[PDB]
Amino acid sequence: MAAPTPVPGIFDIFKKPVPTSCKLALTNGNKREVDAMLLPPSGTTILSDTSGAGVFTAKVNSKCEFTSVSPALPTGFKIEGSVDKEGKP
């Protein structure tokens, strides 16, 4: 009668057993992980700093590595572009 989409997430577990997610982590100069977000490849991660709240937007590539942080990442801060691991983040 009508053809509804049979859900594009059956059989598989809505994730691939390969790096389809990126775990971005903003850490301050003291390396305290001030924020951490699991984003998709080439996504923009909004990371909130508890040191002074710079609210950093880490724009990554499909490599899960940050390419550019908006507004600008200051000296001391480390945006770790961790990848979705073989195990849970």
Domain count, the chain: 1
Residue span of the structural domain in which 61 resides: 22-80
CATH number, domain at 38? 2.10.70.110
Q: How far is CA 9 from CA 31, 40, 71, 72, 89, in A?
A: 38, 17, 36, 37, 22
Distance separating the N- and C-terminal Cα atoms of the chain: 44
- Cα separation, 18 vs 2, in Å, equals 35
Residue 69 domain flag: yes
Residue 7 domain flag: no
- Cα separation, 63 vs 89, in Å, equals 16
Beta carbons of 60 and 39 less than 8 angstroms apart = yes
Residue 35 domain flag: yes
Residue 37 domain flag: yes
Residue 54 domain flag: yes
Q: Is 3 helix (H, G, I), strand (E, B) or coil?
A: coil
The experimental method is NMR
